Scaffold this active site. Structure first.
Site, short mmCIF file in Angstrom:
data_model
loop_
_atom_site.label_atom_id
_atom_site.label_comp_id
_atom_site.label_asym_id
_atom_site.label_seq_id
_atom_site.Cartn_x
_atom_site.Cartn_y
_atom_site.Cartn_z
CG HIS A 37 35.94 23.81 10.88
ND1 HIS A 37 36.48 22.77 11.51
CD2 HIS A 37 35.17 23.05 9.99
CE1 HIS A 37 35.97 21.86 11.14
NE2 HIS A 37 35.24 21.82 10.27
CB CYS A 84 40.80 24.39 13.30
SG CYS A 84 39.15 24.84 13.93
CG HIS A 87 37.22 21.68 16.10
ND1 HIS A 87 36.03 21.17 17.01
CD2 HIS A 87 36.38 22.35 15.03
CE1 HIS A 87 34.96 21.79 16.65
NE2 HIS A 87 35.11 22.45 15.52
CG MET A 92 40.97 20.96 12.08
SD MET A 92 39.39 21.11 11.71
CE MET A 92 39.64 21.81 10.08
#
Ligand SMILES: [Cu+2]
Length: 99
Positions: A37, A84, A87, A92
Site C-alpha cells: 500500500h 494508493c 490500487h 482505494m
C-alpha cells in the site's frame, strides 16, 4: 486520527476514506490488509501552494508489511484528494478536509 490501509475483511479501501481534521493534527496511516500500500497526494487536488512531495510517499515507495505506518500532518485548509498508487483502479482513494 488513525486510518487503516485495507479493511479488516481485506477490502482495498482506506478506513475511514473521508474525514475532517484540524490544522496540524496528525494522520497515521497503518498497513492493515492487502498490502503493499502507499499514500500519494494528488498535486492537482490539494490546496493551492501546497507541495505534494512534502506530504506524500513516492509513487515507488511501498509499505509491504502489517503494522508499517506513514504519518503526516496537514496545515493549509481545504480539501486534499489522495490515493494508493498500486490500487487506485480498485477504488482505494480518499479525501481529507482541513477545516
Ligand atoms: Cu493500497
Amino acid at each position: 486520527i488513525d486510518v487503516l490501509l485495507g479493511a479488516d475483511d481485506g477490502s482495498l479501501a482506506f478506513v475511514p476514506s473521508e474525514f475532517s481534521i484540524s490544522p496540524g493534527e496528525k494522520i497515521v496511516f497503518k498497513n492493515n490488509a492487502g498490502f503493499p500500500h502507499n499514500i500519494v497526494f494528488d498535486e492537482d487536488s490539494i490546496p493551492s501552494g501546497v507541495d505534494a512531495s512534502k506530504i506524500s510517499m513516492s509513487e515507488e515507495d511501498l509499505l509491504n508489511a502489517k503494522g508499517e505506518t506513514f504519518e503526516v500532518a496537514l496545515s493549509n485548509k481545504g480539501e486534499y484528494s489522495f490515493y494508493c498508487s498500486p490500487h487506485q483502479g480498485a477504488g482505494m482513494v480518499g479525501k481529507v478536509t482541513v477545516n
